[PDB]
Paper text:
The N-terminal domains of p85α include an SH3 domain, capable of binding to proline-rich sequences, and a BH (breakpoint cluster region homology) domain.
X-ray diffraction data collection and structure refinement statistics for bovine p85α (105–319) wild type is provided in Supplementary Table S1.
Author numbering:
A (entry chain A): 113 to 167, 172 to 298
B (entry chain B): 113 to 167, 172 to 276, 280 to 298
């Protein structure tokens, strides 16, 4: 709620918000092989999770609380990781643009826009690297790139839009961007 | 011009872009009493000045080159220190609003908007503090708040006159009241 804009939480040469780095690193240390990571609700309500995003070493918390605070963080950003300026344009694309490569090309062009601080694209890259690392231990945590896209795309885009071949295309590019991180 | 956005050059808790801090501190050390500071074209062309901003100690440079790089920096920012949305609103209120105190109240409200990264207001505050320090030795450098406003308002607002006079007056007053 009081979470500052991504552009105010860090700046190059740093690669991601320091709070998001703590969350991701704690979650990867404690939950990389957890087969319900990001798929089960913890006991804590949003007000308790928000308390966590201010105050301690995060490795001290239950991994399912960290996973919920991670989702809480993405929801409480004043503007989503993928700004609506970008989402609005991607949703407007015609059926004749069928190439996932084209959607990805446009996402990168728009999000790298000078009207959008570089921090947004940097944060997304950091998240994609996290999702890719999780998908590499899928034999144990059961997380592939597509499931991760379906779980987190609504948090990254924060867009209420009726499910179309457009919304399916947003989910698909996130899927592709996770798979092709390395 | 590869100069990054103000919001990409630093973030809280830092108070201003590190490159702008280096420029300001060097200029204040070498030119605080210079009767022509910021009013003389130096020898260098824009490409040479950009080399200096795309990088070792700035005190090694001629003060008139530093002053030109300072202006070059403000000109090369992808977005001006005072965003165009803010300038556009202040200009459209020009005939109907005549009060200086109201314009100042509005500039602060608009630039502090949540849609505008905090770095812009922080940079403007840093610049105003520099301009005020210069005006304290105006008897020697001839830079008072009015002259400083006329020189730098077009760079801060990025406007090539008439509706502008209210903008210039805002900066003048903001320089004067740094306390």
């Amino acid at each position: 709620s009081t979470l500052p804009d991504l552009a105010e939480q860090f700046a190059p040469p740093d690669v991601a918000p320091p709070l998001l780095i703590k969350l991701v690193e704690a979650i990867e240390k404690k939950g990389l092989e957890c087969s319900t990571l990001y798929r089960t609700q913890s006991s804590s309500n949003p007000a308790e999770l928000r308390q966590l995003l201010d105050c301690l070493d995060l490795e001290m918390f239950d991994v399912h609380v960290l996973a919920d605070a991670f989702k809480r963080y993405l929801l409480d950003l004043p503007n989503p990781v993928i700004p609506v300026a970008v989402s609005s344009e991607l949703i407007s694309l015609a059926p004749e643009v069928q190439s996932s490569e084209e959607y990805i090309q446009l996402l990168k062009k728009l999000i790298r826009s000078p009207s959008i601080p570089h921090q947004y694209w940097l944060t997304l890259q950091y998240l994609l690297k996290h999702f890719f690392k999780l998908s590499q231990t899928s034999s144990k945590n059961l997380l592939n790139a597509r499931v991760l896209s379906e779980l987190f795309s609504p948090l990254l885009f924060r867009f209420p839009a009726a499910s179309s071949e457009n919304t399916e295309h947003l989910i698909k590019i996130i899927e592709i961007l996770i798979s092709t991180e390395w």
